Tab-separated table of C-alpha atoms in Angstrom:
chain	number	residue	atom	x	y	z
K	15	UNK	CA	-11.970	7.753	-19.939
K	16	UNK	CA	-13.785	6.384	-16.951
K	17	UNK	CA	-14.993	3.162	-18.898
K	18	UNK	CA	-14.846	0.205	-17.023
K	19	UNK	CA	-13.391	-2.929	-19.027
K	20	UNK	CA	-16.846	-4.394	-18.484
K	21	UNK	CA	-18.290	-0.946	-20.829
K	22	UNK	CA	-19.425	0.404	-17.045
K	23	UNK	CA	-18.442	3.829	-15.937
K	24	UNK	CA	-16.644	4.901	-13.028
K	25	UNK	CA	-18.046	7.123	-10.745
K	26	UNK	CA	-15.300	9.397	-8.776
K	27	UNK	CA	-16.278	11.192	-5.428
K	28	UNK	CA	-14.990	14.792	-5.183
K	29	UNK	CA	-12.154	14.245	-3.109
K	30	UNK	CA	-10.379	11.550	-4.984
K	31	UNK	CA	-6.891	12.207	-5.931
K	32	UNK	CA	-6.460	13.326	-9.740
K	33	UNK	CA	-6.290	10.531	-12.144
K	34	UNK	CA	-5.005	10.726	-16.109
K	35	UNK	CA	-4.436	7.881	-18.794
K	36	UNK	CA	-2.018	10.505	-20.356
K	37	UNK	CA	0.843	8.408	-18.571
K	38	UNK	CA	0.784	4.990	-16.362
K	39	UNK	CA	-1.307	6.471	-13.553
K	40	UNK	CA	1.752	6.480	-10.141
K	41	UNK	CA	1.098	6.182	-6.484
K	42	UNK	CA	4.695	6.682	-4.966
K	43	UNK	CA	5.138	5.601	-0.643
K	44	UNK	CA	8.298	6.016	1.056
K	45	UNK	CA	9.725	6.929	4.188
K	46	UNK	CA	13.458	8.021	5.392
K	47	UNK	CA	13.764	7.384	9.301
K	48	UNK	CA	16.707	9.509	8.961
K	49	UNK	CA	15.584	12.928	7.611
K	50	UNK	CA	12.903	14.583	5.483
K	51	UNK	CA	13.040	14.901	1.812
K	52	UNK	CA	15.496	18.053	0.075
K	53	UNK	CA	13.583	20.369	-2.228
K	54	UNK	CA	15.195	18.067	-5.291
K	55	UNK	CA	13.464	15.042	-4.103
K	56	UNK	CA	9.815	16.777	-3.336
K	57	UNK	CA	10.328	18.135	-6.933
K	58	UNK	CA	10.959	14.985	-8.481
K	59	UNK	CA	8.377	12.463	-6.418
K	60	UNK	CA	5.628	15.750	-6.946
K	61	UNK	CA	6.347	15.358	-11.077
K	62	UNK	CA	5.799	11.797	-10.998
K	63	UNK	CA	2.779	11.152	-8.921
K	64	UNK	CA	-0.349	13.180	-7.465
K	65	UNK	CA	-1.273	10.622	-5.176
K	66	UNK	CA	1.256	9.614	-2.653
K	67	UNK	CA	2.101	8.342	1.068
K	68	UNK	CA	4.089	8.924	4.196
K	69	UNK	CA	5.715	5.658	5.884
K	70	UNK	CA	5.753	4.552	9.372
K	71	UNK	CA	8.617	6.338	10.705
K	72	UNK	CA	9.604	8.760	8.409
K	73	UNK	CA	12.051	11.812	9.769
K	74	UNK	CA	11.257	10.125	13.009
K	75	UNK	CA	14.817	10.322	14.035
K	76	UNK	CA	15.264	14.225	13.477
K	77	UNK	CA	11.540	15.330	14.239
K	78	UNK	CA	11.254	13.332	17.170
K	79	UNK	CA	7.349	11.833	15.767
K	80	UNK	CA	6.845	9.939	12.696
K	81	UNK	CA	3.263	12.099	12.345
K	82	UNK	CA	5.708	15.250	12.600
K	83	UNK	CA	7.477	13.886	9.632
K	84	UNK	CA	4.369	13.308	8.078
K	85	UNK	CA	3.054	16.846	8.914
K	86	UNK	CA	6.222	18.280	7.229
K	87	UNK	CA	5.781	16.495	4.057
K	88	UNK	CA	2.228	17.506	3.406
K	89	UNK	CA	3.490	20.911	3.889
K	90	UNK	CA	6.037	20.413	1.513
K	91	UNK	CA	4.215	18.828	-1.102
K	92	UNK	CA	0.822	20.712	-1.087
K	93	UNK	CA	2.627	23.991	-0.998
K	94	UNK	CA	4.696	23.093	-4.705
K	95	UNK	CA	1.273	20.636	-6.094
K	96	UNK	CA	-1.509	22.105	-4.495
K	97	UNK	CA	-3.931	19.322	-6.027
K	98	UNK	CA	-2.016	16.496	-4.650
K	99	UNK	CA	-3.251	14.132	-2.073
K	100	UNK	CA	-0.876	12.806	0.665
K	101	UNK	CA	-1.823	9.768	2.916
K	102	UNK	CA	-0.934	9.152	6.554
K	103	UNK	CA	-0.236	5.613	7.996
K	104	UNK	CA	-0.690	3.716	10.575
K	105	UNK	CA	-0.789	0.110	11.344
K	106	UNK	CA	-3.393	-2.073	12.829
K	107	UNK	CA	-1.609	-4.613	14.521
K	108	UNK	CA	1.904	-4.045	15.043
K	109	UNK	CA	2.752	-1.136	17.545
K	110	UNK	CA	5.525	0.664	15.975
K	111	UNK	CA	6.552	2.899	18.128
K	112	UNK	CA	7.907	5.771	16.066
K	113	UNK	CA	4.844	8.057	16.353
K	114	UNK	CA	3.805	10.105	19.671
K	115	UNK	CA	0.585	7.931	19.923
K	116	UNK	CA	2.429	4.691	20.065
K	117	UNK	CA	5.687	5.765	22.122
K	118	UNK	CA	4.816	4.273	24.994
K	119	UNK	CA	4.687	0.517	23.096
K	120	UNK	CA	8.504	-0.499	24.466
K	121	UNK	CA	9.743	-2.765	26.839
K	122	UNK	CA	11.067	0.385	28.919
K	123	UNK	CA	7.777	2.161	28.870
K	124	UNK	CA	4.995	-0.103	28.300
K	125	UNK	CA	4.716	-1.121	32.449
K	126	UNK	CA	4.586	2.613	33.137
K	127	UNK	CA	0.752	3.172	31.176
K	128	UNK	CA	-1.156	-0.178	32.301
K	129	UNK	CA	-3.869	1.322	30.353
K	130	UNK	CA	-1.979	0.978	27.305
K	131	UNK	CA	-0.500	-2.170	28.132
K	132	UNK	CA	-4.212	-3.817	28.540
K	133	UNK	CA	-4.390	-3.138	24.636
K	134	UNK	CA	-2.105	-5.426	23.685
K	135	UNK	CA	-2.113	-9.171	22.975
K	136	UNK	CA	-0.486	-11.817	25.712
K	137	UNK	CA	1.025	-15.312	25.538
K	138	UNK	CA	-0.813	-17.292	27.500
K	139	UNK	CA	1.858	-20.051	28.492
K	140	UNK	CA	4.580	-17.390	29.541
K	141	UNK	CA	2.081	-14.359	30.262
K	142	UNK	CA	4.624	-12.228	28.904
K	143	UNK	CA	3.582	-9.878	25.760
K	144	UNK	CA	3.674	-11.230	22.309
K	145	UNK	CA	6.219	-9.312	20.009
K	146	UNK	CA	7.759	-9.210	16.734
K	147	UNK	CA	11.615	-8.216	17.349
K	148	UNK	CA	10.175	-6.480	20.388
K	149	UNK	CA	7.067	-4.822	18.650
K	150	UNK	CA	3.917	-5.567	20.684
K	151	UNK	CA	0.310	-6.533	18.765
K	152	UNK	CA	-2.635	-4.806	18.967
K	153	UNK	CA	-5.768	-7.010	20.023
K	154	UNK	CA	-8.722	-5.720	17.658
K	155	UNK	CA	-11.266	-8.117	19.723
K	156	UNK	CA	-10.783	-5.599	22.762
K	157	UNK	CA	-13.391	-2.997	22.156
K	158	UNK	CA	-11.465	-0.386	24.535
K	159	UNK	CA	-8.213	-0.964	21.781
K	160	UNK	CA	-10.675	-0.205	18.711
K	161	UNK	CA	-11.977	3.032	19.936
K	162	UNK	CA	-8.764	4.252	21.678
K	163	UNK	CA	-7.135	3.083	17.806
K	164	UNK	CA	-9.854	5.257	15.689
K	165	UNK	CA	-9.336	8.242	17.861
K	166	UNK	CA	-5.434	7.923	17.535
K	167	UNK	CA	-5.728	7.449	13.652
K	168	UNK	CA	-7.912	10.405	13.573
K	169	UNK	CA	-5.777	12.665	15.556
K	170	UNK	CA	-2.598	11.382	13.587
K	171	UNK	CA	-4.556	12.682	9.979
K	172	UNK	CA	-5.791	16.101	11.733
K	173	UNK	CA	-2.373	16.798	12.956
K	174	UNK	CA	-0.523	16.419	9.831
K	175	UNK	CA	-3.182	17.313	7.517
K	176	UNK	CA	-3.304	14.396	5.754
K	177	UNK	CA	-5.878	13.847	2.890
K	178	UNK	CA	-6.402	10.357	4.346
K	179	UNK	CA	-4.515	7.306	5.426
K	180	UNK	CA	-3.028	4.237	4.403
K	181	UNK	CA	-4.090	1.333	7.372
K	182	UNK	CA	-1.702	-1.724	7.434
K	183	UNK	CA	-2.705	-4.932	7.871
K	184	UNK	CA	-6.258	-6.718	8.259
K	185	UNK	CA	-5.708	-9.955	10.053
K	186	UNK	CA	-5.801	-9.227	13.254
K	187	UNK	CA	-3.652	-12.015	14.606
K	188	UNK	CA	-6.137	-14.556	13.817
K	189	UNK	CA	-3.404	-16.895	13.833
K	190	UNK	CA	-3.043	-16.903	17.701
K	191	UNK	CA	-6.564	-17.058	18.280
K	192	UNK	CA	-7.683	-19.302	15.560
K	193	UNK	CA	-10.936	-20.554	17.198
K	194	UNK	CA	-12.073	-16.811	17.180
K	195	UNK	CA	-11.923	-16.198	13.491
K	196	UNK	CA	-15.382	-15.127	12.983
K	197	UNK	CA	-15.129	-12.618	15.794
K	198	UNK	CA	-11.669	-10.707	15.023
K	199	UNK	CA	-13.135	-10.853	11.348
K	200	UNK	CA	-16.334	-8.791	12.074
K	201	UNK	CA	-14.445	-6.595	15.013
K	202	UNK	CA	-11.818	-5.151	12.230
K	203	UNK	CA	-14.835	-4.489	9.549
K	204	UNK	CA	-16.321	-2.683	12.748
K	205	UNK	CA	-13.058	-0.892	13.471
K	206	UNK	CA	-12.342	0.707	9.765
K	207	UNK	CA	-16.352	1.439	9.574
K	208	UNK	CA	-16.174	3.242	12.817
K	209	UNK	CA	-12.743	5.127	11.819
K	210	UNK	CA	-14.379	6.084	8.195
K	211	UNK	CA	-17.218	7.377	10.018
K	212	UNK	CA	-14.993	9.518	12.239
K	213	UNK	CA	-12.474	10.469	9.627
K	214	UNK	CA	-14.214	13.815	7.799
K	215	UNK	CA	-15.974	12.856	4.811
K	216	UNK	CA	-13.059	13.864	2.207
K	217	UNK	CA	-10.639	11.826	3.456
K	218	UNK	CA	-9.649	8.521	1.693
K	219	UNK	CA	-9.098	5.313	3.903
K	220	UNK	CA	-6.971	2.700	2.039
K	221	UNK	CA	-6.913	-1.050	3.460
K	222	UNK	CA	-3.849	-2.623	2.686
K	223	UNK	CA	-4.896	-5.902	0.924
K	224	UNK	CA	-8.460	-5.368	1.976
K	225	UNK	CA	-9.862	-5.693	-1.431
K	226	UNK	CA	-11.090	-9.216	-0.376
K	227	UNK	CA	-11.757	-8.702	2.895
K	228	UNK	CA	-15.270	-9.010	3.034
K	229	UNK	CA	-16.227	-6.945	6.629
K	230	UNK	CA	-13.520	-4.372	5.478
K	231	UNK	CA	-14.359	-3.878	1.754
K	232	UNK	CA	-17.965	-1.672	2.494
K	233	UNK	CA	-15.641	0.976	4.674
K	234	UNK	CA	-12.764	1.524	2.396
K	235	UNK	CA	-12.374	3.560	-0.657
K	236	UNK	CA	-9.365	2.110	-1.613
K	237	UNK	CA	-6.995	-0.745	-1.499
K	238	UNK	CA	-3.642	-1.859	-2.026
K	239	UNK	CA	-1.988	-5.104	-3.668
K	240	UNK	CA	1.305	-5.479	-1.934
K	241	UNK	CA	2.369	-8.733	-3.849
K	242	UNK	CA	4.613	-9.275	-0.659
K	243	UNK	CA	5.832	-12.753	-1.390
K	244	UNK	CA	5.954	-15.454	-4.601
K	245	UNK	CA	2.092	-16.494	-4.138
K	246	UNK	CA	0.816	-12.804	-4.482
K	247	UNK	CA	3.095	-12.674	-8.147
K	248	UNK	CA	1.831	-16.721	-9.187
K	249	UNK	CA	0.334	-16.777	-12.364
K	250	UNK	CA	-2.966	-17.657	-10.551
K	251	UNK	CA	-3.237	-14.678	-7.682
K	252	UNK	CA	-2.234	-12.392	-10.401
K	253	UNK	CA	-5.087	-13.564	-12.747
K	254	UNK	CA	-7.407	-13.369	-9.454
K	255	UNK	CA	-6.140	-9.956	-9.008
K	256	UNK	CA	-7.330	-8.539	-12.486
K	257	UNK	CA	-10.785	-9.721	-11.567
K	258	UNK	CA	-10.219	-8.023	-8.151
K	259	UNK	CA	-9.051	-4.650	-9.775
K	260	UNK	CA	-12.273	-4.909	-11.653
K	261	UNK	CA	-14.903	-5.367	-9.024
K	262	UNK	CA	-12.835	-2.257	-6.877
K	263	UNK	CA	-13.634	-0.486	-9.899
K	264	UNK	CA	-17.013	-1.331	-10.190
K	265	UNK	CA	-17.691	-0.544	-6.275
K	266	UNK	CA	-16.237	3.132	-6.697
K	267	UNK	CA	-13.223	2.020	-5.151
K	268	UNK	CA	-9.396	2.992	-5.727
K	269	UNK	CA	-6.754	0.003	-6.508
K	270	UNK	CA	-3.046	0.091	-5.701
K	271	UNK	CA	-1.208	-2.320	-7.690
K	272	UNK	CA	2.440	-1.918	-5.760
K	273	UNK	CA	5.279	-4.347	-7.064
K	274	UNK	CA	8.370	-4.435	-4.561
K	275	UNK	CA	10.855	-6.399	-6.783
K	276	UNK	CA	12.273	-7.853	-3.383
K	277	UNK	CA	9.301	-9.934	-2.827
K	278	UNK	CA	10.927	-12.471	-5.978
K	279	UNK	CA	13.601	-13.238	-3.783
K	280	UNK	CA	15.531	-13.379	-7.024
K	281	UNK	CA	18.854	-15.261	-7.113
K	282	UNK	CA	21.243	-12.072	-7.969
K	283	UNK	CA	20.201	-10.674	-4.509
K	284	UNK	CA	21.382	-14.082	-2.880
K	285	UNK	CA	24.103	-13.218	-0.285
K	286	UNK	CA	24.796	-9.317	-0.645
K	287	UNK	CA	24.791	-6.650	1.718
K	288	UNK	CA	24.558	-3.269	2.682
K	289	UNK	CA	24.621	-0.571	-0.973
K	290	UNK	CA	25.921	-3.941	-2.788
K	291	UNK	CA	22.305	-5.398	-2.145
K	292	UNK	CA	20.865	-2.151	-3.215
K	293	UNK	CA	22.282	-2.217	-6.453
K	294	UNK	CA	21.355	-5.310	-7.134
K	295	UNK	CA	17.943	-4.811	-5.954
K	296	UNK	CA	17.941	-1.225	-8.503
K	297	UNK	CA	19.551	-3.072	-11.432
K	298	UNK	CA	16.461	-6.270	-10.563
K	299	UNK	CA	13.507	-3.453	-10.829
K	300	UNK	CA	15.053	-2.072	-13.942
K	301	UNK	CA	15.211	-5.170	-15.840
K	302	UNK	CA	11.795	-6.242	-14.455
K	303	UNK	CA	9.897	-3.002	-15.091
K	304	UNK	CA	7.865	-3.898	-18.069
K	305	UNK	CA	6.814	-7.176	-17.033
K	306	UNK	CA	5.383	-5.607	-14.352
K	307	UNK	CA	4.277	-2.631	-15.915
K	308	UNK	CA	2.646	-4.941	-18.064
K	309	UNK	CA	1.171	-7.065	-15.406
K	310	UNK	CA	-0.995	-3.493	-14.004
K	311	UNK	CA	-1.547	-2.609	-17.566
K	312	UNK	CA	-3.890	-6.049	-18.178
K	313	UNK	CA	-5.949	-5.037	-15.276
K	314	UNK	CA	-5.522	-1.313	-14.868
K	315	UNK	CA	-8.990	0.495	-14.597
K	316	UNK	CA	-9.654	4.124	-13.641
K	317	UNK	CA	-8.720	5.319	-10.537
K	318	UNK	CA	-6.031	2.511	-9.916
K	319	UNK	CA	-2.569	3.662	-9.884
K	320	UNK	CA	1.101	1.308	-10.131
K	321	UNK	CA	3.568	1.762	-7.324
K	322	UNK	CA	7.162	0.300	-8.138
K	323	UNK	CA	10.704	-0.268	-6.357
K	324	UNK	CA	12.277	-2.868	-4.046
K	325	UNK	CA	11.185	-1.404	-0.927
K	326	UNK	CA	9.284	1.213	1.193
K	327	UNK	CA	11.942	3.593	1.701
K	328	UNK	CA	12.484	7.017	-0.450
K	329	UNK	CA	15.897	5.417	-1.613
K	330	UNK	CA	14.027	2.547	-2.859
K	331	UNK	CA	11.986	3.392	-6.310
K	332	UNK	CA	10.689	6.818	-5.971
K	333	UNK	CA	13.765	8.705	-6.706
K	334	UNK	CA	14.497	6.085	-9.749
K	335	UNK	CA	14.110	7.383	-13.520
K	336	UNK	CA	11.750	4.610	-14.975
K	337	UNK	CA	10.857	6.388	-18.116
K	338	UNK	CA	8.819	3.917	-19.623
K	339	UNK	CA	6.389	5.033	-16.788
K	340	UNK	CA	6.666	8.641	-18.569
K	341	UNK	CA	5.372	7.139	-22.155
K	342	UNK	CA	2.279	8.348	-23.520
K	343	UNK	CA	-0.522	5.626	-22.922
K	344	UNK	CA	-3.700	6.743	-23.568
K	345	UNK	CA	-7.478	5.386	-22.826
K	346	UNK	CA	-7.547	1.221	-22.830
K	347	UNK	CA	-9.181	0.013	-25.556
K	348	UNK	CA	-11.617	-2.391	-23.513
K	349	UNK	CA	-10.473	-5.559	-21.773
K	350	UNK	CA	-7.643	-7.524	-21.921
K	351	UNK	CA	-7.943	-10.898	-24.090
K	352	UNK	CA	-6.690	-14.419	-22.712
K	353	UNK	CA	-5.075	-15.327	-25.720
K	354	UNK	CA	-5.906	-18.911	-25.183
K	355	UNK	CA	-7.725	-21.099	-23.049
K	356	UNK	CA	-6.118	-21.945	-20.129
K	357	UNK	CA	-2.502	-20.487	-21.489
K	358	UNK	CA	-0.960	-17.480	-19.598
K	359	UNK	CA	-0.643	-14.960	-22.025
K	360	UNK	CA	-2.621	-11.768	-22.178
K	361	UNK	CA	-2.977	-8.808	-23.866
K	362	UNK	CA	-4.586	-5.487	-24.456
K	363	UNK	CA	-4.536	-2.459	-26.184
K	364	UNK	CA	-4.651	1.502	-25.358
K	365	UNK	CA	-4.689	4.525	-27.384
K	366	UNK	CA	-0.772	4.760	-27.447
K	367	UNK	CA	0.479	1.296	-26.778
K	368	UNK	CA	-0.047	-2.523	-27.045
K	369	UNK	CA	0.676	-4.896	-24.358
K	370	UNK	CA	1.493	-8.667	-23.933
K	371	UNK	CA	1.957	-10.406	-21.113
K	372	UNK	CA	3.070	-14.027	-20.247
K	373	UNK	CA	2.749	-14.728	-16.160
K	374	UNK	CA	4.000	-18.403	-16.606
K	375	UNK	CA	7.238	-17.624	-18.096
K	376	UNK	CA	7.023	-14.179	-17.040
K	377	UNK	CA	8.019	-12.383	-20.221
K	378	UNK	CA	6.570	-9.412	-21.653
K	379	UNK	CA	6.511	-6.653	-24.330
K	380	UNK	CA	4.814	-2.847	-24.311
K	381	UNK	CA	5.017	-1.588	-27.519
K	382	UNK	CA	4.677	2.034	-27.435
K	383	UNK	CA	3.242	4.413	-30.355
């Protein structure tokens, strides 16, 4: 059903990804800086999802540039599953130097490209470029950067053949110029609208954490809830996000409800390193799947999708067998119910499942029919 949880109907556009309530709708987003996906790995992802996104550095160590890695996976996935949608990635804020477009944003090259260096925020006290681990910061207030950036994102979508682009970061480093908050907010909304215009009319623009970003919302076809800290996972914020998923639905937009269990900062993953940390995170994702699956299902709308794992890499979720995500679900039988008044237990029913979740005590049961 295209029915929204308030009885209104969803009106998809022709260029949206495939959607069905047959099992839990899934979005996969991943990269491996080391290499491209093997034959069998493309098959595993493709049988899991009709809607995927290639990450910021994919295969750039072996194909030189991340948009080439993207291009390889668009080709590979479209070959086996023609109806799949594959999104490119680009950050509006951090000048990650993994594409050809951003290759000069490093300490060794940037002084050789003064025209690109003027796009970056400078520390006023030292006169040095601001950075985070030597990754530089775009300045959305600079109109010349915004023009470059839109043209640059369009280039990467066109070269990779992707069906759209995931745009990461909405904040424009407002904390570095908080007196100019309203200007930054407006400038980022203007960037995103100009990008939507420059992109082909069949391209999906996904704004990360943009569902409530007032100036960016009108530009995007899709938004992600990234759940990157415990505040985003709080019982109060989840309640709000189910409301935001409804509003996204009513506006004709797609929602990605993303959970990575590394954001829990659980105690089991305390002082662990390398593969031992990955083993613990995998085992936590398995133990937590029913809870987080239930959290998505309480707010799920048409053209909303679930992404699960413990990171952003090929090896942190996309290749993991979560059999509950393959169980028959069916169309929701209306909107979730708040069990109580003031309590944090919520239920909802689907054709082939019953869902209960307690977002205070962090418990769930999905009864499969």
